[PDB]
Structure 1
Amino acid sequence: LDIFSNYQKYIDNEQEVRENIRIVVREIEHLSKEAQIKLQIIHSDLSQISAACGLARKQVELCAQKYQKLAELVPAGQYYRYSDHWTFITQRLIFIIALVIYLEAGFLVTRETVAEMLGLKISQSEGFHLDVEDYLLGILQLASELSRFATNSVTMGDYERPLNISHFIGDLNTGFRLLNLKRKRFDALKYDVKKIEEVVYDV
C-alpha cells in the first residue's frame, strides 16, 4: 500500500470526473429529446414545420451553453479519454441541426456552422471541438430521416418535397461514395437513396 494510496486517490479522481461529465451529458440529452419530438410533429403536420424549427433552435442554443460547460470539464488533451458520451449525443445534435437547416433551406449545414451554433470550436487545437466523424454520422441520420419524411409528404399530400429530397440525398450519397472504409452507415444511406428514388418514380 506504500504507493498504492496515491493511485487509489488518482483513479477515484478520474472516475469522479467521469461520472461528473455524465451529469452534463444527460442534461444535454434531455434538451435534444425535446427538439426531437418537435420534429416528430413536422412528421404529423406541415403547418408546424416552421414553428417547430424555431423551437428546436431555441433548444440548440441552450445545448450550446452546456457545451461551454463540458468544454470546461475536459482537461488538457484527455478529450479522447472522455470522448464517447458527447459523441453519441452530439451525433444527435448535429443531426437535429442539419435536419432543421434542411427544413429551412434546401441544403445541409457545414461542420463550421454546426460548431458555431453549439458554441464549439472547430479544430482539435482548441481543446474541445466538434470532431468530424461525429459530424458525418449526424448528417447520416439526417439522410435516414428525410426518407420517412418524403414518404410522409406524399402521405399527407405533397408531390413536391420527395423530389427536392431525392436530389439532396442523391448528391449527398454520391458525396459519401468518395469516402473510405475503416462504416455500415454509408451503406444504410446507400439504401435510403433507393427508398426515396422509389417514392419519386411513383410520381
Structure 2
Amino acid sequence: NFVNLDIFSNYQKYIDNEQEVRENIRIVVREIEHLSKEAQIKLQIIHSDLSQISAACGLARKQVELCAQKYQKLAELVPAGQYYRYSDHWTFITQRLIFIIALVIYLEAGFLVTRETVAEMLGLKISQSEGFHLDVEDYLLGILQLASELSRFATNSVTMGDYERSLNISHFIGDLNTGFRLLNL
C-alpha cells in the first residue's frame, strides 16, 4: 500500500520552473498592457474633440512601436513550439493592439488594415512557422472591436455635428458587416 514521494518531489521541480516561465511572461505582458492602455486611453478623445484626432493618432502610433519591442522580450521568452500553451496571456493584449492600430489607420487614411501590416508593425511573424506570430483569430477579433468602436464614433460624430463624417463611418461599418456576413456565427 505505498505512495512513492519521489514521483511527487520530482514534479515539484517541473512545477517550480513552470511557475517561473509563466511568471516572466506575466511580467512582460504586464507592461504591454500598461503601454497599450494609454494609447487607448488617449484615442478616447476622438469622441469629444475632433481636432485632436491627429495628435491622438501620433501618440498611439508611438506606443505601438514602443511595444513592438516588448513583443520581443516576450518573443524569445516562449520556448520550442509552445505558443499555444501560453498564448492565453497575450490574447486580450494582442487584440487591443490590432484594434488600436486598425482605428489609427482608419482615422489616418480611411480604410481597413491588413493583418500583414499589423504584423510588420508589431514586428510579428505572418504565420505560425517563421516564428512568434500574430494569430488570425486575434486579428479578426481586433477588427470586431473596431466595428463596435466606430459605431460609438458615428453617434458621437453626429452630436458634435460632423454629419457627413458620420455617414462615412456608416458606409464603412456596413462594409465590415458584409465582410463578416461572408464568414460565420
Bin of the TM-score, shorter chain as denominator length:
over 0.9
TM-score, normalisation: structure 1: 0.86
**Do the aligned partners of 2:83 and 2:132 also contact (CA within 8 Å) in 1?**
yes
Distance in 1, Cα, partners of 2:61 & 2:131: 25
**Do the aligned partners of 1:98 and 1:142 also contact (CA within 8 Å) in 2?**
yes
- Pick one of 44, 59, 65 that aligns with 1:40: 44
Which consecutive segments of 4 or more residues in structure 1 shift more than 3 A?
A: none
Number of aligned residues: 181
Structure 1 runs not aligned, ≥5 long: 181-202
**Do the aligned partners of 1:79 and 1:127 also contact (CA within 8 Å) in 2?**
no
**Do the aligned partners of 2:151 and 2:173 also contact (CA within 8 Å) in 1?**
no
* Structure 1 residue 55: Cα displacement: 0.4
Cα deviation digits, residues 100-150 of structure 1 (max 9, x gap): 000001111111100111011110002310000000110100001111111
Distance in 1, Cα, partners of 2:6 & 2:58: 59
TM-score, normalisation: structure 2: 0.94
Cα deviation digits, residues 150-203 of structure 1 (max 9, x gap): 1111111101112211111112111011113xxxxxxxxxxxxxxxxxxxxxx9
Distance in 2, Cα, partners of 1:162 & 1:44: 14
- Aligned match of 1:156: 160
Structure 2 runs not aligned, ≥5 long: none
Cα deviation digits, residues 50-95 of structure 1 (max 9, x gap): 0110000000001100001111111011100001111110100000
Distance in 2, Cα, partners of 1:172 & 1:2: 57
Distance in 1, Cα, partners of 2:109 & 2:179: 19
- Aligned match of 1:165: 169
- Pick one of 68, 75, 80 that aligns with 1:71: 75
Alignment of 1:19-98 (within 5 A): 19-98=23-102
Paired-residue identity, %: 99
* Structure 1 residue 98: Cα displacement: 0.2
- Aligned match of 1:197: none
SS of the aligned residue for 1:3 comes to helix
SS of the aligned residue for 1:64 comes to coil
- Aligned match of 1:179: 183
Calculate the aligned-residue CA RMSD, in Å: 2.6
Distance in 2, Cα, partners of 1:15 & 1:110: 36
